[PDB]
Every structure is written in C-alpha cells, then in structure tokens.
Amino acid sequence: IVGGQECKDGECPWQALLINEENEGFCGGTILSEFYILTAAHCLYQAKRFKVRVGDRNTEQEEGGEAVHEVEVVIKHNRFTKETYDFDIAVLRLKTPITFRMNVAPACLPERDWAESTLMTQKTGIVSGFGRTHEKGRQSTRLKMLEVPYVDRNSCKLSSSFIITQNMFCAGYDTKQEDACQGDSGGPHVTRFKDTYFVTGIVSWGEGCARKGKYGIYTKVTAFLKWIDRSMKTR
Amino acid sequence: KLCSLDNGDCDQFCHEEQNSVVCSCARGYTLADNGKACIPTGPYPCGKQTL
Ligand SMILES: O=S(=O)(/C=C/c1ccc(Cl)cc1)N1CCN(CC2CCN(c3ccncc3)CC2)CC1
Ligand SMILES: [Ca+2]
DSSP states (O other), X not given: OBSSEEOOTTTSTTEEEEEOTTOOEEEEEXXXXXXXXXXXXXGGTSOSSXXXXXXXXXXXXXXXXXXXXXEEEEEEOTTOBTTTTBTOOEEEEESSOOOOBTTBOOOBOOOHHHIIIIITTSSEEEEEESOOSSSSSOOOSBOEEEEEEBXXXXXXXXXXXXXXXXXXXXXXXXXXXXXXXXXXXTOEEEEEETTEEEEEEEEEEOSSSSOTTOOEEEEEGGGTHHHHHHHHTOO | OOHHHHGGGOSSEEEOOSSSOEEEOOXXXXXXXXXXXXXXXXXXXXXXXXX
C-alpha cells in the first residue's frame, strides 16, 4: 500500500493475511463469514502451504486479538489463468470458525444489481493490505488502508497495457503516488454505504505500483456473486 | 418509488419490484418495521467497523 493511512483500531476488521511456512504474509484476503475467506486465485500459486491470519494490524507486536486458522479446502476458479489474470478469484473454507471480536469481523456481500448501480457508482472505495509501501521497498509491518477513486471504465482500458476483461475494473490515481503494491493482492476492495462496508473487489494486479498513467486492477466481485454463494455451499 | 432518488430511503439493498420500492438487507440483518432500516441480529454484523 503506497501512500494512504494506517488502519486504526477496528477500522479494517475484515482484513485477512495469508502466511506461508516462514510465517510471512504473501497475500491478502477478505473475511466473508466465520468459515470463508475471499482471495485472488493467483495467490494460491505464490505459496507452498499456507494459513490465514485475522485480527492482526502490526506484524511485529503480538496483539491478543489475533488468531491463526488452517485451510480445509481452497475453491479456486477453474477459468483462471496467469496469462490473462482473468477470473482472479478464490474462496477459502477454514477448518475452524473465526471468532468475531474487535478487529475481526466479516464484510457484507452485496446484491449484484444494487452494487453495480449504487456501490460502484460511488466516487471511491477502500483498499488495504500489509504489502509494500513502495515499488521497491519491503512488505509493510503495519496494515494500511487507501481511499481509491473508481476509474472510468474507458480510461482504464486506454491506460492499461493489457486486456481489461469484464471481470476486472480499475481504481487508483493517474498521477498521485497511491495504489496497492506487492503482497497486497488478494486483499479487500470495499465500498462504503451508510457506515456499512461491502466487498466490491479483489486486489488483482497492476503494471508496477502507483505508476503515472497506470491504475490498480481489481477483480470485479459483483461478477462472481452467485459463484461465491455456490462456493460457500462448497463446490 | 425510484431507488435512484436516494436509494429509495433504504439502508441497503433497494428493489423496484412492482410500482413501489422494496428494501432488503445483507445476511445477518433483518428489515426493520418501517421496511426501510436494517437491524443487526448479532454482536458482529458484516460491514460494520468494530469501533
Ligand atoms: O509491482 S507488482 O508487485 C504489482 C503491484 C500491484 C499494484 C496494484 C494492484 Cl490493485 C495490485 C498489485 N508486479 C507488477 C507486474 N506483475 C506481472 C504482470 C504480467 C502481465 N499482466 C496481464 C494482465 C491482463 N492480461 C494479460 C497480462 C499483469 C501482471 C507482477 C507483480
Ligand atoms: Ca500482531
């Protein structure tokens, strides 16, 4: 997360972290409910075996609100492929349930129609993660959050060097030095409506971080709703 | 009517079924008596910051 603020107490409770053997965060996720985590399919490749961590805001000083959960089964979308990064989405079924407490709570899944017309037509959305605070620096120790304006679907395609599929959308800034970065992928893209937040996207990819002229590419959640429900019933 | 006005005065989901407005809520919430407001049925309802 280049630029942006720090997630203060309880501000980003639906945030999740995928940790590897080394116990280091390599990707993000979004807590959907006590048993399921939302993430990007391409993150399932960046690690041998992994577990997820909730209620963690500082990777250094142990916070009693933390918990580690093992994965029971990963539902990765078949249509996904690294060449196009299309269908960059996946749902995780946890072995033990998540104890919702402060800094640990689920994000609401919206209705498809309502979201596309009310949620994604809002000016901004919020993205967060423990990823790099710079294109070359190292993984962040603190959980950050960034207000990212929605990007006109057209500008998105023009600025982009790759095929922006209908399963993706742009968010970020053209010049301002703010956008997600490595390690942030898989994280939550949420939109705010009357103090209640809704999952809207999955930190997917970009051509670098906060590059002038480029934007952050996010998996369009509203385009996989029915798929997510199916997954929460496992399939 | 007109979920476009101001979301039809709903708290969350807004549907225009028939001629009128029709509000609803995310899982974990129950529609209020006024059929507009959404009410949490648990200590940690989705989309709410634990402040
Ligand atoms: O700097 S990064 O670490 C990313 C940080 C970041 C920033 C914003 C967001 Cl919302 C998410 C992630 N780096 C850049 C290059 N790509 C690798 C690229 C390989 C080619 N590519 C596509 C996309 C669509 N069709 C065909 C090819 C995109 C990805 C790997 C990773
Ligand atoms: Ca900690």
